[PDB]
Swiss-Prot record:
Subcellular locations according to the entry: Cytoplasm; Cytoplasm, Cytoskeleton, Microtubule organizing center, Centrosome, Centriolar satellite; Apical cell membrane; Dynein axonemal particle
Span list, region Interaction with DNAAF11: 8-54
Subunit details: Interacts (via C-terminus) with DNAAF11 (via CS domain); this interaction stabilizes DNAAF11 at the protein level. Interacts (via C-terminus) with DNAL1; this interaction stabilizes DNAL1 at the protein level. Interacts with DNAAF4, HSPA8, IQUB, RUVBL2 and DYNTL5.
Binding site for Zn(2+) 1: 18, 21, 38, 42
Protein name: Zinc finger MYND domain-containing protein 10
Superkingdom, taxonomy of origin: Eukaryota
Binding site for Zn(2+) 2: 29, 32, 50, 54
Zinc finger boundaries on the chain: MYND-type: 18-54
Disease / disorder: Ciliary dyskinesia, primary, 22: A disorder characterized by abnormalities of motile cilia. Respiratory infections leading to chronic inflammation and bronchiectasis are recurrent, due to defects in the respiratory cilia. Patients may exhibit randomization of left-right body asymmetry and situs inversus, due to dysfunction of monocilia at the embryonic node. Primary ciliary dyskinesia associated with situs inversus is referred to as Kartagener syndrome.
Similarity comment: family membership: Belongs to the ZMYND10 family.
Full protein stretch here: 384 to 430 of 440
Known function: Plays a role in axonemal structure organization and motility. Involved in axonemal pre-assembly of inner and outer dynein arms (IDA and ODA, respectively) for proper axoneme building for cilia motility. May act by indirectly regulating transcription of dynein proteins.
Origin species: Homo sapiens (Human)
Length: 60
């Protein structure tokens, strides 16, 4: 080879966490996209607490 490998280390992925059940989240708040929620329901239950700061940095 020419470039070769950079280094050999345990490289593992990562994932967010729900804001209601604290479970592996996949989608973020479609309102501010600053929060995480495994399911839509959760994003609705924690709303009371989320909506508080929700809609932070307004953006398309
Ligand atoms: Zn959840
Ligand atoms: Zn939000």
């Amino acid at each position: 080879g020419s470039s070769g490998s950079s280094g050999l280390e345990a490289v593992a992925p990562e994932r967010p966490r729900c804001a209601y059940c604290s479970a592996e989240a996949s989608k973020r708040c479609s309102r501010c996209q600053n929060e995480w929620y495994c399911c839509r329901e959760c994003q609705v239950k924690h709303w009371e607490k989320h909506g508080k700061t929700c809609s932070g940095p307004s953006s398309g």
